[PDB]
């Protein structure tokens, strides 16, 4: 199985709402999906796992707790899965990671992740709306 990331970079102004998305590309097989972010260091990588607005990859796995921090983890029937981040701040900038775990019950486990960069801007150079 593969994970597709339609967008590599998301450039948003502050106060806006953004939806980051990933696509799961295809008997006792089940898929577990979630999100996290890289650490805010010099090099951003999905091998680093940090919570998003203090919500862990366990908290965000596929509601009320996420809603309090302006987050919503959701999915489609067509492999698509996403995280909505409301009322964006400069601090939200960084590398975001969508994680998928394929479980063949008591037999095997395979894990794949996708990555996308989110840049939140303010001032003269900042874009008009999420684009």
């Amino acid at each position, epitope marked *: 199985f593969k994970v597709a990331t339609p967008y590599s970079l998301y450039v948003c102004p502050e106060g806006q709402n953004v939806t980051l998305t990933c696509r799961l590309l295809g008997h*006792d097989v089940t898929f*577990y999906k979630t999100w996290y972010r890289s650490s805010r260091g010099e090099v951003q990588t999905c091998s680093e796992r940090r919570p998003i607005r203090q919500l*862990t990859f366990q*908290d965000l796995h596929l509601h009320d707790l996420a809603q309090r921090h302006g987050l919503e983890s959701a999915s489609d029937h067509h492999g698509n899965f996403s995280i909505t981040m409301r009322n964006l701040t400069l601090l939200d900038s960084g590398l975001y990671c969508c994680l998928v*775990v394929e*479980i063949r*019950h*008591h*037999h095997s*486990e395979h894990r794949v992740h996708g990555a996308m960069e989110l840049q939140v801007q303010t001032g003269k150079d900042a874009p008009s709306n999420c684009v």
Partner: antibody
Amino acid sequence: EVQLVESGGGLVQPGKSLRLSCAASGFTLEDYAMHWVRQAPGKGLEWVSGIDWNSENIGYADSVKGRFTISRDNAKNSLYLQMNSLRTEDTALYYCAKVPGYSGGWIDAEDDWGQGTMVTVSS
Amino acid sequence: EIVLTQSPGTLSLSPGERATLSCRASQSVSSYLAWYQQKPGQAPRLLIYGASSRATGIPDRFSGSGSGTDFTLTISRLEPEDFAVYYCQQYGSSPFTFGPGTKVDIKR
């Protein structure tokens, strides 16, 4: 295909130490809380210790606090149990398990257990 | 600390009957309540997590219910292969101690 291989068990003199190890194949430990559960022959299950994925949250059964130390190495997909000041009461089959507790629901529907390793504390 | 009790200590039933197993907690459980089945010479198997959710591969005849301090495991259409000890365990507040188990015997 999927297994938790245990080792380091066996006969130990009372007051001495033993280090159990539990290594995963078929799946990676990096996302999961891991636990030690023991059972004296013909007795009930007894939770020994638990550790979350990033070694932040750690818990111990009262009777083993101070004497036993749970640790893990995600790069070696291994869970450890350093047992000091061993007593006859510690004689039991020790299981390592990928089960709920410090898991946050990830992934509670799927469990995995080691075959168990016997620890006998005797002179 | 949360202390769990289980009743009855032993249940002896004919196949096809319904087994009602009880788990009581000394205080309200967070629903981070699990049920395990253990057959002789084998590691325990998770049956129920979150008080009422079946683990992967668990048949529908095993059903978990209850909340707070009173939890139930119902095994309908009991089979001879269901001979085991059934343990409850809370995993929300450390130590994650197990209940003393209910031994289910088969009448024949």
